[PDB]
Design a protein around this ligand. Structure first.
Ligand SMILES: Cc1ncc(COP(=O)(O)O)c(CNC[C@@H](N)C(=O)O)c1O
Ligand SMILES: Cc1ncc(COP(=O)(O)O)c(CNC[C@@H](N)C(=O)O)c1O
Ligand SMILES: [Cl-]
Ligand SMILES: [Zn+2]
Ligand SMILES: [Zn+2]
Lengths: 373, 373
């Protein structure tokens, strides 16, 4: 479809503005340069080699992934310095070890002594150590050890020193995912600040105890979009969603509408005057239901038409009302193309086997994401 | 993974009990035989050749699909008598016509004179007619013409008689999707009855007007699971979800827990005592958020453990509480496998590139679904 005009694509179609995405990627890289920290982009928003190449500024080095299928896909694509940003899967250690042996640098995360115990009973060998990060829970309420829990310091000690030829402690890793529960720069920054200070305190505690911890990593798209100076005391930031942004991030204050690279293109396929509704060929199969539970009106906005809203999604159909009761079927003929702005980029992207990547109205590339586990 | 024990699979893993699914398929076929009607299973719940083969009782004939990608996939798989159960996509008529020419019987649906007009300006040729069904709106509130709207009868007349060598009216098609908004057999049957009687009335109206309409088709999984005798006056039923069922259908009363063929297997990957939570390796990427907006507690139940409930899903993590405040970490060690029963089979299945199909504890096949548009 290279060269094709967007309104020519078969819908529903996930489109990515390459100019916007390139810009988002370069901006995050510059924020990190200004802070003096490295950027380790998380790839789970797009799951593509091409997106990885952009986020990484062409180097193919320094990413985080959320599954072993991503790890393998990006490894096969020539990436390295790959962090599996997930409690290391002790049931699949053979797969992890295969990656650790193929890659110059494959990093894993853990937060349980039994997980460290599992790594010990499956040595890598071959002059390779498990490159282990300690996952810190700093308010996220998910995985990781609490920085004020004595268990944390001891686990860090165990990872760093207890078998230095089989296992090394690369650093601590926190994810301030809680920034999603609060709107406005001020609250986002407070969470960033709490998380940053918790990490810094923990690292200071480690250095006082003699536990070598060379790296410290936090990041979420909301906090990395408006960074605080305290972040220059860390070594690495690992946001991911920012490469695309979405309506959720626009509502949070992370970005402006112009920063959202992603749309789902859909065609009007029906008028129903007796109901006041347009029928479009985008249902939850192209969109997901993210944004609904917090109904369908929250799943997407119609780009350039605030008057319209979603009022129904089935697997392959969506219903649009003017919810001014004042619909104008003449302005939206059957066959015309609307651009939906989805609530959650990661969720929408996971529904598409292909992304139509465009510049100035025309398709310039096709990106095909990996999926699965 | 053939022969493998289920607890051996890499999680999260979508599993289908082949004995349950075979049973569901044969039961629906028998209901239809008892009624004297044909079964045209909709394949969108599973989107696999293998599921199509079961639903179809081995014949590979008589299905409904929801997209041109399904149409093509099932055509390439040797199926025929395929109905595209969707307003015919007038922007992609070349694709439709390619299928109409390759297949003995490719059926399309419409509900707009302009859509019929579009079919006329793109004749099939080669001794082939567009095989057109009229979509009826009988309370569903989606697509189709209302049976009491004079426009319906005229469109049916136009399809049947206005260009009999280019276009034929195969029948009327209704989908009682509204059965999803009401629990209990009685209300489900009322909707089935309203829909059936509306269709029958419309067909009687057609015969009085001299419009040949040989087929009449309704169906949804809730109404076809407890059919009414009035349905024997139709010619065809087209449910789809019943091949798997799910928690939603169990709550509606369509099926019993034993009829649900589908699970998502997930591993406990973490204990968090200070929160009372288990961490499992199934997030929304393996589950979808269906069942949430009507929070996460509604997305799935843990098979054999009513005590547990979901309280959080991120892309790749889920959180389980005992919500008796009384968790018992000893009964759920890290590494153990739980079976989630998802809310909406179709939504969950759309998240998986492979289904692990098993009999008596062991994997017997891998089904790979098509996706996209
Ligand atoms: C047009 C059409 N025909 C048949 C079916 C099968 O219904 P069941 O899922 O078996 O009850 C459907 C499916 N219905 C609803 C979907 N559009 C959805 O939103 O999930 C159908 O649409
Ligand atoms: C462990 C881990 N590290 C980094 C990120 C990137 O965060 P952003 O999406 O860019 O804000 C994540 C992602 N977070 C939340 C997901 N688990 C989800 O539920 O969507 C992460 O998990
Ligand atoms: Cl969803
Ligand atoms: Zn996300
Ligand atoms: Zn469904």
């Amino acid at each position: 479809w290279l060269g094709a005009l967007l309104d020519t694509l078969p819908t529903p179609a996930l489109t990515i503005d390459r100019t916007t995405a390139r810009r988002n990627a370069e901006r995050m890289r510059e924020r990190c340069r200004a802070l003096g920290v490295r950027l380790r982009p998380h790839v789970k928003t797009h799951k593509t080699l091409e997106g990885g190449l952009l986020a990484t500024g062409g180097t193919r080095r320094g990413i985080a992934v959320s599954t072993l299928a991503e790890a393998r896909f990006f490894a096969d694509g020539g990436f390295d310095d790959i962090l599996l940003a997930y409690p290391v899967p002790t049931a699949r250690l053979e797969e992890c070890a295969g990656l650790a042996r193929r890659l110059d640098a494959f990093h894993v995360l853990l937060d349980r002594p039994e997980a460290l115990a599992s790594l010990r009973q499956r040595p890598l060998g071959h002059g390779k150590r498990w490159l282990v990060w300690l996952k810190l829970d700093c308010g996220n309420g998910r995985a990781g050890v609490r920085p004020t829990d004595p268990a944390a310091l001891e686990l860090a000690q165990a990872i760093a020193n207890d078998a230095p030829e089989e296992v090394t402690l690369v650093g601590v890793y926190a994810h301030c995912g809680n920034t999603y529960g609060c709107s406005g720069a001020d609250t986002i920054q407070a969470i960033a600040r709490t998380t940053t200070n918790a990490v810094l305190s923990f690292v200071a505690a480690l250095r006082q105890a003699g536990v070598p911890c060379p790296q410290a990593s936090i990041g979420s798209t909301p906090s990395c979009s408006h960074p605080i100076p305290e972040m220059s005391q860390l070594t690495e930031l690992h946001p991911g969603n920012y490469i695309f942004y979405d309506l959720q991030q626009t509502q949070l204050g992370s970005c402006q509408p112009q920063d959202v690279a992603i749309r789902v293109l859909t065609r009007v396929i029906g008028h129903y005057a007796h109901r006041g509704q347009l029928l479009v060929d985008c249902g939850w199969a192209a969109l997901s239901l993210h944004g609904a539970g917090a109904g369908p009106q929250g799943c997407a906005a119609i780009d350039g038409h605030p008057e319209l809203r979603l009022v129904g999604l089935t697997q392959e159909h969506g219903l649009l009302e003017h919810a001014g009761g004042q619909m104008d079927f003449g302005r939206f003929p059957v066959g015309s193309v609307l651009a939906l702005i989805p609530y959650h980029a990661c969720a929408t992207a996971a529904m598409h086997p292909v992304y139509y990547v465009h510049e100035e109205g025309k398709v310039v590339a096709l990106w095909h994401p990996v999926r699965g586990w």
